[model samples]
Target: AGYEPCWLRYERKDQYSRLRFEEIVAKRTSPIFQAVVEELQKGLRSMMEIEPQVVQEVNETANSIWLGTLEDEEFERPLEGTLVHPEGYVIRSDVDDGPFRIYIIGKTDAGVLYGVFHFLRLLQMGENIAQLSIIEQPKNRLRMINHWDNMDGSIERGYAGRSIFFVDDQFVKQNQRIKDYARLLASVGINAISINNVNVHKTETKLITDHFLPDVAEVADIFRTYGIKTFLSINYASPIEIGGLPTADPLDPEVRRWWKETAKRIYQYIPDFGGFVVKARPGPFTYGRDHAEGANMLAEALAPFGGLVIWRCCQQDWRDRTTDRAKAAYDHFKPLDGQFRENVILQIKNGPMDFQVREPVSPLFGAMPKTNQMMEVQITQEYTGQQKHLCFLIPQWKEVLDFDTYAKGKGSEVKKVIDGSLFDYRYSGIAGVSNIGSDPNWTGHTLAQANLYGFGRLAWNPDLSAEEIANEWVVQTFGDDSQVVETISWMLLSSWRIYENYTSPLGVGWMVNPGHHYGPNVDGYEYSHWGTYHYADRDGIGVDRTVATGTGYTAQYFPENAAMYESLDTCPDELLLFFHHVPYTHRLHSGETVIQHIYNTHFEGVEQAKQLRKRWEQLKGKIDEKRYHDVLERLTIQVEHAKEWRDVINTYFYRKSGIDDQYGRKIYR
Candidate 1:
């Protein structure tokens, strides 16, 4: 699997059919499935050694196998309650009926499609095919990825390379790569996707008009066959820009009518249109309404077609004087829970702020109940070293999924809420900002591909462990090499903490360079318009988000969490600065003073990152040159970046607090 396309790789399979039963299922379906189908057919013919047929439906054959929709006569559906999910599937053998038969039943075309892939994966793993019945459904409603692809063929946060969708400001006429992309997404139970950047410029604003619809539908058609629905990030001021309406007001009649008609027109171009992802009035876009007014306006338009309005509402601005950017999402969205329509879902960042290595869970996840919500994680390594450093994000996301918000009671974890079990939401799931671009190794860093792969799998079922997901992705990418698997797993599991250790000590985040958010700059957001602040001065270095003596941000959490964060003694050392403004000498639960902890972690993080590089070098001849060298080079860059982080952060704290490293290490010289 070349890195650029990310794990849709279909390798050669040549096997002889072991039993006569293996010949039956291949008789169903035609070449309508294309290359992916051919890949599977090849796998079956080689692995099972049976020449199977591809037919439209299953026939009455007891000796062979059958695969298709429920209308197939040979298929016996699973138990009634067994279909917990609409797309859930079953594989069973009628031992007593005829000469012994096997069947795979999909509720819909896509489910059948996924069923086929699942069956093949099991076969690849050398599992027994007879009497095998396992039904699985996505725990999350919307397993999606948001591409930051710009009209000019550049990805905003993309590390891969160039835009796969557009080239030189125009849509590519024939994009074969897109078909494979769709196949990869379908294989992991992803249903929704947004192809454009959220910050829609002038040309992108025309995505809805006839200008781009023809090409957009071409791409969407390829996605539809794989059961993936297409979504576009729209300019919030579309009513005024595209329709000639005077205002883009949510309550305005003309604006609403324009949107309804616009949606109707969009469905004409593509019937299964997933709908619009609006940035609303939060960013630089000028839509003159609150997020509720903006999101609901688009939601009403999409409701008729079962379409969704995905609103990206959170602050990236670090300059707000009073509000904590870490608390912005909850402050903005929590109070207006019941106001949104059934179709409207607020796509929240995992943390209340931007994607950082280590931060508390977004308070909005627990705060919103009546409103449908979606978790927006960034698989794109835009912030966590931008794929220049190898950071496997599955473990970071695992922690987020397992966080206990104590909302409905003791067992209220975010995984349950986003998965729709806790709140029973109309629409709930996870969406990740995509990392893919035009890079030959799909993700710039080969190992970074795991983040995208793991996001889909983990979002489908939050209970999947980081280790399990990592091993699965590693095996699929690098084959069953133990050395490759073990080394890569170790790197990913430790990368997040290693990155955190060097940059932003004591959980006082946002110390990166201003615009692009790379390297390190201690006072980067300290005095800026963005609301992030560490409040470092001559004597202390922390922000006071506490309820009593601080910003009172702790009161926003549920009572159980609120009380824990409100008291300094009870707050976890990792997040003490997030909830309180304490002196540099404040003793942490880890038994290190705040100043000493910063020094130790910053220095130790750099060394760990270097050690990680050394670990990868040990695999020089164990894995392929392309993969081994790719990872090795990235680890090298990571160590350099880590050193930069360590020196800058250590020096900044030492200067501000006039504190020495308790162990007497060099500060800046």
Candidate 2:
């Protein structure tokens, strides 16, 4: 009861009972179908203060909520639109005609569950359901969340509390939170999840074995009820680590057979198990085989059971400066696009670099026409203030999805690529790094929960505007007060840009302290081996990734995009440093010189951070005492840290460039 229910809070409403869900009628009584009934009953009771009777069959002359799959002939309803996706659903209510009733129908049971959530969402947003007709379908086939949770009760980049799935190297026997988490995910149309860290550790390596499969099955069973498929982040070296095999070379026959049998046993435990999320090369090009070889080997094994292989492309040798981390993924996998099996999906990060505050969209988005690809976005704010400071990532992700990859030409955007429209690949979708943990608020910062909510909404429909998602979440989370909605929405809408303003300048990333990556330390990775660098000499700064005299990272993009980043004149002012080395005197397209732009944004960012706290103060008595204080406390911290960021970053460049702010504003130096 202590933990916030996130968007499913379902506060009391007098008119909620007026909608009249007197009975819930379903065609089948399968576990998933039963879950739908349970959710409707629970949600109705909580929101409307009325209990709905559950019935196996629908009565033609009664006020009821009728729902089931399209396969059921008894509940036939004409679906609208040209493309009727399998997970699509239709919701219509008849009042003027025979029997005032509501009909929620889907092409499958999962779709029915989605319809239930959508219907509930409309009620939460205070929509008139008396005359309702809605046809909804997910744009992407796979919407997934990957937890960097470990068996040791710790999360790798987790900023919240302990792991929700595991504690003390074993599954937590009690799992109400796990079920609640499932409800939260399913409500947002998330269909899949990988429960452990992709950097699968030793204890996690045995997740596929008998010692852990039972626990895994228990968790999977919980997720299955909510119409979400469960997946495991498997150790690529599992054959050697757990199977007692000497080698894990994908080409080896025994190594291949071991995985085939492993898949058989896993399916026995979890018949509808999603598949394996493999980190083929977490470190050191161990197998010496290409990603396609290792990925295909696992794909061949899982294909028999209709399982997929989510092979990650995170291999980057930080020591090699000539080897650009931005180009590593495209160079490595672009050549082997057609080589991957049909069941294999190459999971690529949203940006060429790590999840910095800002960067150009990954060229890999539309690079491979012959392969299945899914883009990965970090919901957890590892680099973007780590949930300690308010940072809404929906705007940043929207930019990534909206960017023109120009693979096939001008209209070839990144969203089209991953939504399986651009290349028409066999499989493609979106995956976000899970941000929830053991915190009572789900995410450490109460406002940070919006990022999780936003990610799932974007995955469901990438075309949804950041403002629309923010508006919906604000209404559902904080009630339908116009003042509260407007204040929270403005705070969320402006957060990414505000955070970007104070933090690293112009897409040259990683200005945080090393290892923990918290507060600012200007040269954190500058001289280190991590491929991220600002290369700030006394005269100039930034990495030259151009082909003329640099790492040639720009060559990976399509000709148009590549040429855009290759030259200084065309590159966006925001990403000036990310693509080219520039002198402090270089004039930006924004009219200000690079150094002056840095000073101005940093100063403006601190003031903006202060304003964030003031804006939240206006809603003091409006919000609950506990939540009000919690969010206010975080906002206070954000202002303080924002000043720290302003001082450190501004002073570092001020001294380096040996320049004075033309406005004569106070610099820490």
Candidate 3:
């Protein structure tokens, strides 16, 4: 149960919600309600050893669970305020003793499904459900997952096992795992997914045609029942690469007709298909067309079917930087804000550079008012320890979402901008790269499952604190053992900071080893031919991103951010190296010199990582031996790997700067 079901695992627990599970009164006979019945039966039978009596209408049974939509006949909805999203629901408990029941009402069928999942989560968390009043909806309209899965059984940056849906250059024929994956996603309120790698090799280009439409439709069929829309990542050169054409020009009449017909065939296979997520290059320098012309062509084709074209605003080829690469995304796309069609939405990363452990929020959050925009984040842990080390990402993402972009005024946070309240674009939300695979545990590490759960929970409601999410995940996944809960929760909550402390100090990211990107190598991405310029020297060890001296990247943001990042006194210490170059003696807001801060954190993080193993080791008898030993093994390895990081960084700093640790800690000089 602990190995296969993940957070959906339900052990024997006595709660008020379990009392009402004896009978379920379902209002609809749709596939969604079918799911509700099966889920309720599975959970009830497992936890209380009873099967619920399924009924179509209300009866004399008190303490029954009722499931229905607001659109049903004779059902009255007590909608209190102006509703914002269609996928919202209300879970109310009747105060009266007679016919006492728990009502799970949805604004729609999808809403009803979401409501049941939330209700089950409450029961799993051991909450008092006898008296309940909950109005819940996803803050982000597009809480999506992007699969970096290739047809050849390989994943782009996947750290788990092989691809779950595809292997050996085609679909894997088994749909049971796909259905289980959908259940896992829908339980966390993920409404959309793109099922292919965004890189879109030549073989994947045929996915839009009948050659692969049947297999794609089979997967989409499973997700449809789970209330998740399916999307495809398309190859941009499909017209020429696969269609035997001379050029795949956007303005060409044949190219235009090709996409229109392609959309027709895809919708024939999947009538309610979401749309295309194109892997855009640095610019639309292809075939003498600009960015708008290229995106609008795809937009024009999908617009008739109520579909969308998500044009990714990514800046690539980050080598040889005369200017700060962080400024490239805003500089590339901000000028074309109003030029894109209404159906074309731009997806931007959280930061200017790649998904580093820490970076200042990208300036494009509110830079484009007229264009529909979305946020894309990485959950695969490429830079945050790759699931081998315990690095939870909820706290890191919370910081990004809560950051004030100052696009409108004082309160224009990035969350407000992407959730479509600040700019009010036609379409906007958040999407994250998936981290799961064919591994029986889903993620490689047993505890890394928390990150996947936390990403979706945050996507549903950004206001949930990291501690609350971790507690919920720990309690549900590991059953409610007190020591197991508290120990793992602290491990997850402190992991990201501990990872950052040992790896990269002050946000001078990309100290990872080349190729596999696993661990401890200085000058892995040397920034330029001269690796000496960025990290260490006799003088300074960070990039200068201020307008007064360096690449003028600060000016791309609003005035408030510009002044904050540009000034040395106001910049946050965590991101000081990212925004400014400073001498070894430069004092941080934390009252320590830059070099000493690096030395202390580098050494301290190793000790903290060592302690992580000791804490988890205390839970040997508290959890299942398999899960207990699985996590303990990883934590033990992290302690050793963390030493490599400490030695690599501290040795480089000492040799280049010729500075002894002020505390006389071991520097391996």
- Against the true structure, whose lDDT is highest? 2
lDDT of 1 by residue, 1-669 (tens): 343435544333435425455344543353323433565576566556656665544456536555655655443454513565766666666656456666666665556667777766666544667677677777887899999999899889777888889988899766778877777787787888999999998889999998889889989988887778899999877887877888777777988999899899899999889999877532222544677777887888888898999887634444443566666678777878898888888888888767877778888887888988888999888779899987889888988999899999998999888887888998888999988877878788888888888998897788998998887777666655688789878888888888888888766677989888888998887777667788888877778888676667777779998899888899988888777777889999999998899999988988899889988898788777877787888888888878888899888888788888988876794
Off by over 4 Å in 2: 15-17, 73-75, 80-83, 281-285, 314-321
> Against the unseen true structure, what C-alpha lDDT does each candidate score?
0.78, 0.89, 0.85
The TM-score of predicted model 2 comes to 0.97
Which window of ten consecutive residues has the lowest lDDT sum in model 1?
Answer: 27-36
TM match of model 1 to true structure: 0.92
Give TM-scores for every candidate, taking all chains together and pairing residue i with residue i.
Answer: 0.92, 0.97, 0.96
Q: Compute the lDDT for candidate 3.
A: 0.85
lDDT of 3 at 336: 87
**C-alpha lDDT (0 to 100) for residue 375 of candidate 2:** 93
Error of 1 at 155 (Å): 1.3
Residues 1-669 of candidate 2: C-alpha lDDT, one tens digit per residue: 869999997777875345665678878888888888888887888888878778878777778888777666463556533327888888888645777778888878888999999998987888878888889889899899999999999999998889999998999989998999999999999999999999888899999999999999999999999989999999888888888888888888999999999999999999998999988633225767788888999999999999999988834454555878777778878889799999999999999888999988888888899999999999989999999889999999989998998899899999999999988977889999988899999999999999999998999999999999999999999998899999999999999899999999999988999999998999987767667888887788888999998899888888998898899999889998999999988999989999999999999999999999999999989999999999999999999999999999989998888998889988978
